């Protein structure tokens, strides 16, 4: 109810740049995922759920068909690339090397996970080795943590001292991403929208009109 007793929404006109996130030419490795803050703009969510072809569109805590009717103080868009089978880890309470070591959602998550097959653009003949993921880490990530360190992981008793060797591994590994890989191992571009509400005037809303208020009912 962003003052909807009678229609009253912000007089803003600039559109939110979802295209710069969804239609980006290049995406980031999941270990080094990017985030874009969306603010001070009108967000037409109809251009998302009714356009394009997505493989996964799972919203937690909010229905996607009501986004054009709600307002938020901030909305964040996190984008990355993982395997098709690994998309199931992008959800609250999930486990796995992606959920634990690369991207973790909180249990009280309020947003939408959007994913689509990207094999025709994020995979090359000889194999795309530019997309990486974290294979080893001393503990699980906190919700929305972003670890970009390349410290040599000590798997054995002897200390590594920052040199690769016996039981001392480089923590990152490269996806293969070949166009003939099995569909479950093909690259999927994922984007996660987080809907943040603070004690502050809302800055992102759906396209609505306005009236002029009465001193009555």
């Amino acid at each position, epitope marked *: 109810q962003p003052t909807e007793s009678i229609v009253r929404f912000p007089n803003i006109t600039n559109l939110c740049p979802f295209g710069e996130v969804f239609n980006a030419t290049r995406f980031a490795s999941v270990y080094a995922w990017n985030r874009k803050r969306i603010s001070n703009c009108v967000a037409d969510y109809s251009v998302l759920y009714n356009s394009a072809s997505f*493989s996964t569109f799972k*919203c937690y*805590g909010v229905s996607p068909t009501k986004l054009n009717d709600l307002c938020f103080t901030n909305v964040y868009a996190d984008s990355f690339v993982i395997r098709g089978d690994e998309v199931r880890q992008i959800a609250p309470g999930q486990t796995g090397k992606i959920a634990d070591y690369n991207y973790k959602l909180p249990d009280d998550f309020t947003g939408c996970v959007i994913a689509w097959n990207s094999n025709n653009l994020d995979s090359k003949v000889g194999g795309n080795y530019n997309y990486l993921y974290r294979l080893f880490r001393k503990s699980n990530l906190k919700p929305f943590e972003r670890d970009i360190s390349t410290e040599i992981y000590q798997a054995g008793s002897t200390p590594c001292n920052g040199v690769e060797g016996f039981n001392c591994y480089f923590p990152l590994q490269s996806y293969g991403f070949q166009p003939t890989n099995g569909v479950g191992y093909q690259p999927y571009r994922v984007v996660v929208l987080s809907f943040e509400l603070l004690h502050a005037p809302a800055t992102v809303c759906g396209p609505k009109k306005s009236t002029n208020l009465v001193k009555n009912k």
Partner: antibody
Amino acid sequence: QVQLQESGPGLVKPSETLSLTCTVSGGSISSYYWSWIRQPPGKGLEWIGYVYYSGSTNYNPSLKSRVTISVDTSKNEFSLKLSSVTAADTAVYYCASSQRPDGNLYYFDYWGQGTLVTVSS
Amino acid sequence: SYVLTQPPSVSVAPGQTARITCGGNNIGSKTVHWYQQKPGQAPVLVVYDDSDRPSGIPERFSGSNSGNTATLTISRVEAGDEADYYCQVWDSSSDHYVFGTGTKVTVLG
């Protein structure tokens, strides 16, 4: 457009495994979620599970231990296997799908005619 | 497991607006779809995305979803709408698709 047609036996013994097959025509299997839904006589609809064109599956938690859903892209069909059936498994089994992504926006607008499966001694 | 609760039967006069209620704990944060099933036939999608309708369904079908209550409104009720209606939603926490118990709308008179 896309039409779905189920096929399978109409009678199963009270302890054998049920096998069904949904033959899709008019279109392709690629890049969609193909589901199985059943309805006992005079009762409501119950979703069983789906199969993604990669082969990944998601099942009803009540039927997870007994359901197997496979897909054959080179034959344009997906199948269902339900082990250790019981009298409560007598139902009309439909196959359904849509062009919507998994979750929230997913619905069933492509339906089959439905084949009745009876579990009798 | 998630539960969608519907009344087993409701009845309306020919011409009025029939309403089918679909109850669920905080269902307003979920996307409700509706299906019509006539005897001896498969269910057909009549309402999707809370309130939209497919190209074949007439504009007298409409849907609402607000505060643990989703409502399917059928205006100008005719004899040929007497059928069984089910609401269907996807559960986020269980990753499951649930159907309503079912409602048999009978035209009075």
